[PDB]
Design a protein around this ligand. Structure first.
Ligand SMILES: [Mg+2]
Ligand SMILES: [Mg+2]
Ligand SMILES: [Mg+2]
Ligand SMILES: [Mg+2]
Ligand SMILES: [Mg+2]
Lengths: 376, 376, 376
């Protein structure tokens, strides 16, 4: 059985009968007629609404944490996947793999109507990237978010604030290892690691970048992937954040992201070499410094450079201290936030030092990334 | 009458005839065939294009102010509402309720084809949230925007710059009580009120938050909804803005949002207790300080804290003045913008004081919120 | 031949037979039935998916530079244009006009399946804005981007980083003359010109705005379109940037956008009057200062004002130096970045001077705009 048809040009001056259906052979679609409107009413092909992802609440993430190891996709969520229309009329549980402390997971809605998480960010086990659509993810932290203002524990669990979807997420290209602070912006859960090109900026249980362990040189700014910076200047850490679509925090962002940490308390000892791990000779465990949003080592471990200048100035003469990229005159300090392991009672969510010019490279300054919250 | 149909798998190898219409029984949609392409051309179900909202000009708001109390939705606006395609081929009047000075209104496109405003932000009177779709809103201000640089008047009217829609709006979750400054970013029409949890940050005829009338403690940072901060430090104002998805202005934003105010002039008297209302003993009326964008009390009434540091530093010694959240070293002032009622000829759209550390909490400093402009 | 049909209310209780197709006469669409679900499964009209623009990779631009004067639209790109569905299953060459050094081009997808560029931003030659849909563009630069840190050449060619599309672009309303820096944010290729209202902020071979040649007064802040500012204070440049949906760069942005320039080198001579052109008496050619991203005269030519305050303060005494818009107390310097033609070895991608208050207006300070990267 074939229906009445013709080109779009033939349809343009065609007022059919009421309830007549024809086929536009140029467009390969149906045109409905009403016996009055010339041209009729063409229907949409599926090609145009592929990649459709609709949520009932566009200003909230698509998933809900229901327990330490469990989560659900929300009701009224519709996801086009592999030509199919997969929807969830009620809250539906997400099928989890084995969960391992300090690991990021992707959530997929598959063409068979199921929803599931996986450590693989191309495709979940038993599927391909065609039959399973990556729609979001979360971080499975090594410890809880702070319930009050005394840090958290060492019980691994899903960080509820780390839940992102493809329309509710970090603006940074890579959303992994980040958490949403008070609904306003995202922060890296972990301090920047040396090997941030392969690991991303925010990873559990890696060597922390600082003035004595400089980060890998950005491949977007002359790095080859092996080379590191010679030191931990503000300039270098800032460059690394730009590489990853992030920036260093300002004071408003830092006090927000670090809230929940144990205030006026430092790690103690002689160093904090590693993210999410007790420091060298430390008197407080890493989890003492977990913020309400699951920011790990949020204060009292290492200063983070900040994206703000002020305080003590350098010399009022040109000083070539930018790694060979010009000189500075009356250069103000770049902000340092949080305090370090040796700061005793000066550390906190509002701890700030404005005595270091951006060229300084001590062992006790690293960096934490932040970025804008993106709704699509 | 029933049509030839099968599963998607049966359709995959099926190359029918030209102008053949079949039914995919898995997708419950029509598949047009051309007698050549295997699989055919599946058509889109309506579920995938619910929440459709299309504007002719995506880089501008969907509505136009046509007078003090009237507005239209723009031609070429298509709006899906409860199954129905509602479109406006010409500029169409919005049905208005009684308009009350200093009130925010929501605009709805209803399934009967009408468009109407209402002070209720769930549903207009005579409709529900299902038969009426909130697509935007505006602020009906207590006075005019400034036509030049001498403030405005006291004739209540729609603020054209306060018009927002669901794809042209403040990035902050709550778009109410904000105005678009020079197309670049949004600013709170009103200074922050004490009771901002219930009122939002920007509300007419409320008590202003300052150093001697601290804002309600953010419920995202340890507040219970009843208690206020112990004082009105920069820290607390910045936190309140973060809560609401906003920030304090920088100097570039402040001069823009305040342009149109009466420069080098202050409210006079002894206080400015209330938004959108004359100050206590004021020698200038409140409307003298309305900006071009309809920012009320934009200068010369109360300083706003700013999101920028510099100027005079605190001691080059660790100072525990952050409300118990660490110490600061060589802490630069946080900018103050605009001047207060007591600032005589120092006030204006570029008035700035950089002698106040963030720990200061005076009766003459409050806050005004800003946030990014969001196009979707 | 007419099909069974009725209103939407009649369709509500109607459960048809499997594979039945009726016509909703209110919606003028087809409803597929399955013999169980009441209401059936309505199909979408084409009206709801007009403006459809879909890319395989939504986190990258839709085009690829394939040579100095050639480019292609990417595989998997689907564009609605004038009723048609135009798709490119493989990388498809863009038809180019004559390309002229220092010119912006728009890319159009047309309703005959062709893709083409044109210097005209309303429609390409041989088409209208109805039969040709503007979906992006690029800058054809007067010389290459920097391959390393010695600037670029003077071979006119497409700047790969200046490629934008309608869903991958500067947040600023006008995306022309900008380039994407490290995937993170957009920068003006050229320093701000005097005639920025008609030219945009970023244009080749125009007079550069600075303290001795003030920019046109913004028409959003009291300008008539002919008058220039009384001087080139920070305030005026910041206002111009706000007008165009941009801002001055912070330190993190400046070091990123200028990377690739010839470091510790200045233009020399007595002046740099013009964008993309050798300075007056210059000892280094303009292209020596082209950055990796194709930012022209990125360092060593004129200082840019920055959107950050610190360093040397003005008097701790109210000073009326804001052009009649209030007074400032302890005003910190506004950052200057890059060095100017007379800065010898002090110039570079991290050159900074914090000794000029915002009220200063010398011949060697101009401005460069930046804005956020927008993905839709
Ligand atoms: Mg270390
Ligand atoms: Mg700043
Ligand atoms: Mg008060
Ligand atoms: Mg000049
Ligand atoms: Mg500063």
């Amino acid at each position: 059985v074939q229906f009445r048809g013709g080109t779009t040009a033939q349809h343009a001056t065609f007022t059919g009968a009421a309830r007549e259906i024809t086929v536009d052979t140029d467009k390969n679609t149906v045109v409905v007629h009403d016996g009055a409107t010339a041209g009729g009413f063409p229907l949409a092909r599926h090609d145009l609404v592929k990649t459709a992802f609709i949520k009932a609440d566009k200003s909230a993430v698509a998933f809900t944490r229901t327990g330490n190891a469990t989560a659900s996709i929300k009701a009224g969520t519709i996801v086009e996947v592999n030509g199919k229309l997969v929807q969830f009329t009620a809250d539906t549980a997400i099928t989890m793999p084995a969960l391992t402390a300090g690991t990021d997971y992707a959530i997929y809605v598959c063409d068979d109507g199921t929803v599931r998480a996986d450590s693989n960010f191309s495709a979940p086990t038993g599927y391909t990237s065609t039959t399973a659509r990556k729609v979001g993810g979360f971080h499975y932290a090594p410890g809880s978010n702070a319930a009050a203002q005394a840090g958290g524990n060492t019980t691994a669990q899903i960080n509820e604030y780390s839940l992102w979807d493809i329309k509710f997420r970090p603006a940074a290209l890579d959303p992994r290892g980040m958490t949403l602070v008070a609904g306003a912006f995202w922060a890296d859960i972990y301090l920047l690691g040396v090997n941030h090109l392969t690991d991303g900026t925010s990873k559990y249980n890696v060597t922390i970048a600082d003035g004595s362990a400089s980060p890998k040189k950005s491949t977007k700014f002359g790095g080859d992937g092996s080379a590191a910076y010679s030191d931990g200047a503000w300039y270098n850490f800032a460059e690394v954040m730009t590489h990853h679509g992030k920036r260093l925090p300002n004071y408003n962002e830092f006090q927000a992201l670090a809230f929940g940490t144990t205030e006026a308390t430092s790690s103690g000892g002689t160093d904090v070499p590693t993210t999410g791990v007790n420091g060298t000779g430390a008197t407080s465990a890493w989890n003492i410094f977990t913020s309400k949003w699951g920011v790990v080592q949020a204060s009292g471990c290492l200063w983070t450079w900040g994206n703000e200048f002020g305080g003590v100035n350098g010399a009022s003469e040109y000083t070539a201290n930018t790694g060979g990229r010009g000189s500075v005159y009356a250069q103000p300090a770049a902000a340092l936030f949080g305090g370090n392991w040796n700061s005793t009672s000066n550390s906190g969510s509002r701890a700030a030092n404005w005595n270091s010019g951006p060229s300084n490279s001590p062992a006790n300054i690293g960096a934490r990334g932040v970025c804008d919250h993106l709704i699509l």
